[PDB]
Amino acid sequence: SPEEEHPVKAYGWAVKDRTTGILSPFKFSRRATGDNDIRIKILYCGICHTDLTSVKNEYEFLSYPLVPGMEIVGIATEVGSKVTKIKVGEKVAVAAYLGTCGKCYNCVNDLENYCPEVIIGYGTPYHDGTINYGGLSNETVVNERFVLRFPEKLSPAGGAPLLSAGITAYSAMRNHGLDKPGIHLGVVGLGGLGHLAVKFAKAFGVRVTVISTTPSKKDEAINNLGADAFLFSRDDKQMRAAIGTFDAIIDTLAVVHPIAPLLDLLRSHGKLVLVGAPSKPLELPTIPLLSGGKSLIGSAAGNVKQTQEMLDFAAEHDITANIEVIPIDYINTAMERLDKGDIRFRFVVDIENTLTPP
Amino acid sequence: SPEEEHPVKAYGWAVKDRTTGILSPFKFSRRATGDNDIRIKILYCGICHTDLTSVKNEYEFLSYPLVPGMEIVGIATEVGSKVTKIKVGEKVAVAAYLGTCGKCYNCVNDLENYCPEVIIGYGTPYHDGTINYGGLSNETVVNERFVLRFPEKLSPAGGAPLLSAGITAYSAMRNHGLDKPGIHLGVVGLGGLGHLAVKFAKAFGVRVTVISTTPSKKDEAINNLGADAFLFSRDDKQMRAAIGTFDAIIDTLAVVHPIAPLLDLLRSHGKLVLVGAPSKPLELPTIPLLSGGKSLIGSAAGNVKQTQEMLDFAAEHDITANIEVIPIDYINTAMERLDKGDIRFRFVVDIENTLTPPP
Ligand SMILES: C/C=C1/C[N@@H+]2CCc3c([nH]c4ccccc34)[C@@](COC(C)=O)(C(=O)OC)[C@H]1CC2
Ligand SMILES: C/C=C1/C[N@@H+]2CCc3c([nH]c4ccccc34)[C@@](COC(C)=O)(C(=O)OC)[C@H]1CC2
Numbered sequence A: 001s002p003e004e005e006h007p008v009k010a011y012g013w014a015v016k017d018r019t020t021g022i023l024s025p026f027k028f029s030r031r032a033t034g035d036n037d038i039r040i041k042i043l044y045c046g047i048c049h050t051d052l053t054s055v056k057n058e059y060e061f062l063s064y065p066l067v068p069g070m071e072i073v074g075i076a077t078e079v080g081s082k083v084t085k086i087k088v089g090e091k092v093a094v095a096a097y098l099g100t101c102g103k104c105y106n107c108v109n110d111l112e113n114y115c116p117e118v119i120i121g122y123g124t125p126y127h128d129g130t131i132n133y134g135g136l137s138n139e140t141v142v143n144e145r146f147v148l149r150f151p152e153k154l155s156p157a158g159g160a161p162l163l164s165a166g167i168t169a170y171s172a173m174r175n176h177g178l179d180k181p182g183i184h185l186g187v188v189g190l191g192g193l194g195h196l197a198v199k200f201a202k203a204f205g206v207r208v209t210v211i212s213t214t215p216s217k218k219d220e221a222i223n224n225l226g227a228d229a230f231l232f233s234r235d236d237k238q239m240r241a242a243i244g245t246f247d248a249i250i251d252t253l254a255v256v257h258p259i260a261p262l263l264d265l266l267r268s269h270g271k272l273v274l275v276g277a278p279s280k281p282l283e284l285p286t287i288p289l290l291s292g293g294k295s296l297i298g299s300a301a302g303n304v305k306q307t308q309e310m311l312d313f314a315a316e317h318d319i320t321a322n323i324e325v326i327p328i329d330y331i332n333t334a335m336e337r338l339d340k341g342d343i344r345f346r347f348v349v350d351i352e353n354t355l356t357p358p
Numbered sequence B: 001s002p003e004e005e006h007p008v009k010a011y012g013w014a015v016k017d018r019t020t021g022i023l024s025p026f027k028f029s030r031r032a033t034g035d036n037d038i039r040i041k042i043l044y045c046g047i048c049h050t051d052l053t054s055v056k057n058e059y060e061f062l063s064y065p066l067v068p069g070m071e072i073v074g075i076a077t078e079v080g081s082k083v084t085k086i087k088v089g090e091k092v093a094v095a096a097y098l099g100t101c102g103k104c105y106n107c108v109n110d111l112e113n114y115c116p117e118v119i120i121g122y123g124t125p126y127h128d129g130t131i132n133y134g135g136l137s138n139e140t141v142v143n144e145r146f147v148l149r150f151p152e153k154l155s156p157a158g159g160a161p162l163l164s165a166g167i168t169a170y171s172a173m174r175n176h177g178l179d180k181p182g183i184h185l186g187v188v189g190l191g192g193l194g195h196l197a198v199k200f201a202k203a204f205g206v207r208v209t210v211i212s213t214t215p216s217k218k219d220e221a222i223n224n225l226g227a228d229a230f231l232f233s234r235d236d237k238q239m240r241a242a243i244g245t246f247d248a249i250i251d252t253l254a255v256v257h258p259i260a261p262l263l264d265l266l267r268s269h270g271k272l273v274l275v276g277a278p279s280k281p282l283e284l285p286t287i288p289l290l291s292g293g294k295s296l297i298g299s300a301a302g303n304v305k306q307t308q309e310m311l312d313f314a315a316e317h318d319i320t321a322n323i324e325v326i327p328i329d330y331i332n333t334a335m336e337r338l339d340k341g342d343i344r345f346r347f348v349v350d351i352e353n354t355l356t357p358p359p
């Protein structure tokens, strides 16, 4: 029994029947506080496109009942005897993964988001063999290595999507030098990840073009986010005039799309950084890749030290997501709106004020 | 008309009918020596898989009659008034491309192989609008920037495949730091490009595993080429035992193949360098790419300063291709053997002694 598997009671919303994807009230339990654990009372949980893909039953390996949500901002209500960096009552946030092997090269050099055995935010077994429950719940318990200190100046709700969308965009750009004035960057897709890529790029001084198939988004892209230009990808005239003009492109789309027009936008030796995860494979245009000497680079989240640095950057430059704050019992309707793209640009669930037991 | 479009006569072998891919004797002409040109009497021409892909009619943009061959070693018989780096009588070699726009960033910075308007070795228009004829011919004339000095100590026939296979392997490794001892390198495919990547890596001190679908190649890979290990690609125990063990993999195959097993062989942040050009599309497994923070990097030939440097390295370290020297009128059978992989590891055509004028 989920309410009997562990000693401390907990509750949230869960997809009980994977074939419908409907979340409903759900009681379970969480492990006791180990020596290095932090109990977190959850304030806000962001909703990302991976949550939606999970509720659409598109990830076979996940276990159900599924409690998704992996953009958690909360309060530490309890720390184990060996926690010293975080005091009870502090505002904290959780990384988009919950553990690593602790022994490989990535873990030992604090690049642990690339551990081959990274434990994702929910739906798979933790080190103690039990399935992980995510942020659509009242409280969570996390090993202190994966708990960040949340800056006092950052809106807890507006900053919650920095914990997976923001860090993915921030890290991709920091690791590949796309954070310096003089770089011309393309951002493909203007959803949660894309709109945060535009904000971080502006704060670095990067010149940014948004590349989109939705012309109604030109106005938000230029006026709201500060993009230097808007490229309608279906307009062959604009596409040909941008050939060879980008140093890098950050591709955030969750659907299958052609890669070669994107490679033709790159100058020689430019990088196409892939951070979205389409559920179907893409075609590798070999001659454009070879002849331009171009690179396809994958990137996922960021390591926990980079995430702390990202949060402190976001607090100093007032970088938050554009959010709609929702009650938990709206989550099923939000999923539909997220599926249609009717959100500008992030849902954030107010857990503390709107979740109650089943 | 091919014989009348330029002032100097020439001859070789050509695919006249693109739908059969059969080469036959062919008379044409080549331009006069301009001020910056070098006329080259062709001694040897290497045959690569791209020649075969061209003769299989898989590249729409080529024009016919098609004279392929782009691994040319020769003797300078004539230089334009403004040539000084090359003397008549010198052994020379030609890069696998013939010109560039001359004005873009890649051009002005001696990275000209990545010029967006690079003129390839044959089958497309030159700066004067005429179709280029490749190395399966008696002489060629090339702008001096794309002519290399060929080392005296290097075998002209064993060194001919350095001009496209060798340079592609050398540059890919020099450009991405796969030339430093301590790197564990995978070489996928043990054909012309693959076997020169192994030699170049052993000469750099790099630990090299050959990844192959042909177990019969294990003895040649370990004993003749010097590979440190041989990984049979179809053996799941072996593939699973190598997961996460490679720093980089150079993928040399000319056919479609699954990409995700190769990405699993890479450690996190590892590089998969693509130098073969399969004619059908490849599938990109994003989840492994994303999960590992891994890279797919394309690379093509090398610049001409790098090609010269590759040649002097190959002379000082005795790096040559393992070749079968063939007469030109065997080229159609060689194409068949090349299609089946029945060659260890390069055909080189002896142009000077076996090519004669048609009829
Ligand atoms: C940063 C979150 C993304 C999301 N998507 C898809 C995959 C995925 C991840 N978490 C999930 C949880 C449930 C279902 C799917 C996923 C994750 C988590 O981030 C890290 C460093 O683990 C991932 O597994 O990358 C290895 C990230 C990749 C892109
Ligand atoms: C070095 C040769 C390869 C070959 N294949 C395929 C494509 C191609 C090139 N030459 C040909 C000539 C005839 C038909 C196809 C090709 C080339 C060479 O161009 C250079 C050296 O700059 C290429 O990149 O052409 C833009 C190389 C890429 C892989």
Ligand SMILES: [Zn+2]
Pocket (backbone or CB within 6 Å): A100, A101, A102, A103, A104, A105, A106, A107, A115, A116, A117
């Ligand atoms: Zn690890």
Ligand SMILES: [Zn+2]
Pocket (backbone or CB within 6 Å): B100, B101, B102, B103, B104, B105, B106, B107, B115, B116, B117
């Ligand atoms: Zn150029």
